[PDB]
Point group: D2
Chain length 128, copies 4
């Protein structure tokens, strides 16, 4: 039940995207230790390199409000296969999430992929 | 003063385990809503996000598109200077005439604007 | 003219499969050495690198630290504007007085400087 | 023999770093289809988010000179375990390199890790 709600939150973010250059929305639902969620949207810039992905938007929102303990991340796109977080997003994930933290990826027609931080970013570069 | 206080109080909440250089931001909408930003570093420095951009990403994620003021604060002898990446995100979302207040330690402030910080801006 | 030609000729070599918006750069050292930059996009747009920054990274990787001119070109009606991220990298490595020539289509040019593009720069 | 030369190139980049903020050098040796190499260095900025990693510096050098076919990447750091490319670097790797392209990571005391693009960035986000 909870996972279905998180998926709906990530999907709803697709209509909150700021993507006037790619027209490629991505949505995220980041779940905290308490179960409160932070929604992420893609936010582009005319200089493409300053674009901020939905996953990172969710982390920056949560971390700015003092969140440091995360239990799940859901990411959605309008894609034939489940949306894949880019490497920059995976690196921010690794800063704040345990390797075992589950990640649910969804795409068109209900396609889903169950994964984890450890699986998305093996041998991760960290403060360590 | 409330906007200055929001930016300064953010300094004690920043995620800066690598620089120990906190930056705070207060982004104000036309409706008067306040969005607070902090800098959020990463073990890979290039993935660090500035306080100004954190505030914009928060506000834009909640549908805000009309901004009337930005305050940026640091623990600096002179009023802190927004970096060029932050200025480019300001230009994406703010009118050139939108005022920007820069703050440092011991009450020092500098009044500026989007137009002055990023002249001949790269745009759409 | 050679510096302008280097920046314009880079436009046909850019890696821009997503924007199809090429940008070229020519970075000149005090010794007269030329470094050419192109923009290099990524499927994740946020990992895109601008032509100006490509030129700086090339030059700095070869030990260059003294820069006397930067030319930036685009296929634009007015002279192309460096984004704020590029301006911040210029400020890392260039004196405020270093001249910057901006170029667009049909011979349009704009003369500027690091100091004018990024006033009150965030620094060391 | 060739791999030892690439490792020396990546190690030599450690003395070409521009890292006045972290004092954490990273070196890279990117090998093209012809065997010509591009050396990468870490290049920091006072605004940390504009820092460019050694791996990406090597790719940007090579790609600016028309290179699009890469056969190996070596990365070096002064680290107890073999240096780990961050996720941003892995994402640029995936733009230009085949999943099977080998990656050699080295650290202090000759420690080495043999890996690949597919292993560093599974289920990679791409143009596809
Ligand atoms: C799937 As993405 C472009 O938000 O890293
Ligand atoms: C003053 As800043 C490092 O947040 O651009
Ligand atoms: C003019 As540009 C997109 O290289 O900063
Ligand atoms: C190991 As690195 C900081 O060059 O991604
Ligand atoms: Zn991403
Ligand atoms: Zn900044
Ligand atoms: Zn730029
Ligand atoms: Zn990296």
């Amino acid at each position: 039940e909870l996972k279905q709600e998180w998926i709906n939150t990530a999907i709803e973010a697709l209509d909150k995207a700021y993507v006037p250059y790619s027209h490629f929305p991505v949505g995220a639902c980041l779940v905290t230790e308490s179960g409160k969620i932070y929604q992420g949207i893609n936010i582009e810039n005319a200089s493409f390199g300053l674009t901020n992905c939905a996953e990172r938007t969710a982390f920056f929102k949560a971390v700015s409000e003092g969140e440091r303990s995360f239990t799940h991340l859901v990411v959605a796109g309008h894609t034939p296969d489940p949306i894949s977080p880019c490497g920059a997003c995976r690196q921010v994930m690794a800063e704040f999430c345990a390797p075992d933290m589950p990640v649910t990826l969804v795409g068109d027609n209900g396609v889903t992929k169950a994964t984890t931080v450890r699986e998305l970013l093996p041998y991760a570069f960290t403060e360590k």
